[PDB]
Amino acid sequence: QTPLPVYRISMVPTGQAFAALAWDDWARITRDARLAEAVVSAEAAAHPDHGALGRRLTDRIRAQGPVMPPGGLDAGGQMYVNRNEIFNGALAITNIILDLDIALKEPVPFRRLHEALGHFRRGALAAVQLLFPAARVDPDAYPCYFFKSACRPSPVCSCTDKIGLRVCMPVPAPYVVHGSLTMRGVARVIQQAVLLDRDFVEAIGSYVKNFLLIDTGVYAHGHSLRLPYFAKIAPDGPACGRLLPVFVIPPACKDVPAFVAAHADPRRFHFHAPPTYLASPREIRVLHSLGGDYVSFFERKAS
Amino acid sequence: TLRRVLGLTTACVPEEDALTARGLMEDACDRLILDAFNKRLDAEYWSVRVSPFEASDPLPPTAFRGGALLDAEHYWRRVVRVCPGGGESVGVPVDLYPRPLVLPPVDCAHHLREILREIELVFTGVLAGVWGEGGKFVYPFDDKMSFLFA
Amino acid sequence: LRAVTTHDPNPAASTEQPSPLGREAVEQFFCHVRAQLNIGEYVKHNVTPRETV
Ligand SMILES: [Zn+2]
């Protein structure tokens, strides 16, 4: 049944394969990155504070998934080591997916990073509320999912200069987004809203080199983005940098176990995954334009 | 739409009446385009008839393999338009292939523009005649509705 | 420089006028730079949403 997801696999030692899949084994893909509901409940009972709870859960999950089995393998056996989703211009976007690429001059801790993520979540939600005015977005309960590329040669961080992150958040109902330009505009607005947050800048501004975080060129027909739970292929050696969840719990979360378990749902990190409604949409508003080519006010005035 | 507009004119109002008529016409066009989406996958509904005395798309080489289906073409040729790529917009002789057909998405934007031209002709004529308006009637399709098919 | 020019040496009967240098610059340019900072203002000035129901 179609539409289907088409992925681009990076074969070793060179070459690119393609895979159009009607269904897949996601339980096997996300297996060694899951926390038993009993463990989550016990930790929630232990630590009431949500920052501490999220850091504890992140530490627990980090020390669970050892490795995805690497080696040789043909395209059918490598689609479980590397996999990128290709943006299709004939479909609608139901998730806002941001590929953050921070650049540092001094290594950042992980508690500082968690605080910075908690601050980032606050401004992005305000930007989203401004962009989608007909939807009720609660800034202290809306779910946002954070993934951080693993560390290769409170969990410690051994990164060198760059901290790769992925942020996923559903488009508020009853809104849908159509177009590659529209998504670029949404990314622009999100980045501007985040960069204006005083708390986020104060918390993370010391270590960073530049304040250009969200790459807005990843939204183009045919371009591919790496999926969570998949590692980059290094021709030099083995796979590295798996994207694994970094739990940043909302302050007003009412179901912590559900939030934790929603990080392994493949529908939460795909561009055109079907929306998760409750009964049925009585009406949906498609945002099919957000202006156009942007340039800038400083550019128009100067010209 | 014309029935509604000419029935509104009976109540009588100044140029405000012309503005109301323009609004009604735009609403009618919007509803027509919205209802044309549910028939986006039907190829015989969007197929248009062509006479032997007009310019038509060249016959695809695969149309000559129909066999007994080419024995029923004597005057009219029904051609639909499909988009197999970026902007190809090729033409398909619907009646020269066995059924069911397996085609790419239909080019409903081009067909809808062709129909909207005729619709706007009538609406502009009505506006110019009943209320003396030099302003032509134009419907924004590429700005407000072209996303449903792209 | 035309605003700060004088044609009478007497300070009381001088022909100097206020300079519209800072005022014009602020009104035409520096207002929008600050207007950018507010996120709501930024969205209001650098986005034109188009949505269909
Ligand atoms: Zn790290």
Curated annotation (Swiss-Prot), chain A:
Family indicated by similarity: Belongs to the herpesviridae DNA primase family.
Binding partners and assembly: Associates with the helicase and the primase-associated factor to form the helicase-primase factor.
Record-given protein name: DNA primase
Organism this protein belongs to: Human herpesvirus 1 (strain 17)
Location within or outside the cell: Host nucleus
Domain of life: Viruses
Site (Essential for primase activity): D99, D101
Function of the protein: Essential component of the helicase/primase complex. Unwinds the DNA at the replication forks and generates single-stranded DNA for both leading and lagging strand synthesis. The primase initiates primer synthesis and thereby produces large amount of short RNA primers on the lagging strand that the polymerase elongates using dNTPs.
Swiss-Prot record, chain B:
Function recorded in the entry: Component of the helicase/primase complex. Unwinds the DNA at the replication forks and generates single-stranded DNA for both leading and lagging strand synthesis. The primase synthesizes short RNA primers on the lagging strand that the polymerase presumably elongates using dNTPs. The primase-associated factor has no known catalytic activity in the complex and may serve to facilitate the formation of the replisome by directly interacting with the origin-binding protein and the polymerase.
Family: Belongs to the herpesviridae HEPA family.
Designated name of the protein: DNA helicase/primase complex-associated protein
Cell compartment(s), UniProt: Host nucleus
Assembly and oligomerization: Associates with the primase and the helicase to form the helicase-primase complex. Interacts with the origin-binding protein. Interacts with the polymerase catalytic subunit.
Record organism: Human herpesvirus 1 (strain 17) (HHV-1)
